[PDB]
Amino acid sequence: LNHLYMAVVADHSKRPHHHGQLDGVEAVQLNNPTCGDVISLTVKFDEDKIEDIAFAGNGCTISTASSSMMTDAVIGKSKEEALALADIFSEMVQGQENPAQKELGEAELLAGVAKFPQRIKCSTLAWNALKEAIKR
Ligand SMILES: [Zn+2]
């Protein structure tokens, strides 16, 4: 029942979702905890919502997985909705319990990074590139 989790996290790191870059969209680039992760996160908004999203970069398994899962979780949400999820994720990876972590989708599998301090920032990188993208 747990072996499936490894396959889901592995799939997000090896075959990222919403990977690459969107056309005609000024990307948002941030980088490392210290680990050496980087991401270019192009985000499209048609309304206040997120029409589409895409990312590219280089990181550890944790950081790539987390970027990939972040895209799934936020696609078609809202400056504020997306930003609330970011807060939810960020709090989850500091050991907080919250039923709302369900709204994170497969990113919920990264609850375990709260036990690895150096990994916190690996996992949040994508979320913070999102925060910046929304806030333009
Ligand atoms: Zn990392």
State the distance from the centre of ligand 1 to the C-alpha of 38, rounded, in angstroms: 9
Residues 6+ apart with CB under 8 A from 7: none
Give all domains of the chain, ordered by start, each with its CATH number: 1-136 (3.90.1010.10)
Query: What distance, in Å, lies between the first and last C-alpha atoms of the chain?
Result: 41
- Ligand 1 centre to CA of 91 (Å) is 18
Contact status, residue 67 vs residue 125, Cβ threshold 8 Å: yes
Solved by what technique? Answer: X-ray
Extract the annotated binding site for Zn(2+): 35, 37, 60, 122
H/E segment holding residue 61: helix 61-74
Contacts of 82 (CB under 8 A, 6+ apart): 50, 74, 130, 134
Neighbour-count burial of 83, counting CB atoms closer than 10 A to its CB (0-12 exposed, 13-18 middle, 19+ buried): middle
Q: How far is the CA of 43 from the centre of ligand 1 (A)?
A: 22
Q: Which among 40, 127, 53 is positioned nearest to 91, based on CA atoms?
A: 127
Distance separating alpha carbons of residues 124 and 74, to the nearest angstrom: 14
Distance from Cα 45 to the centre of ligand 1, integer Å:
28
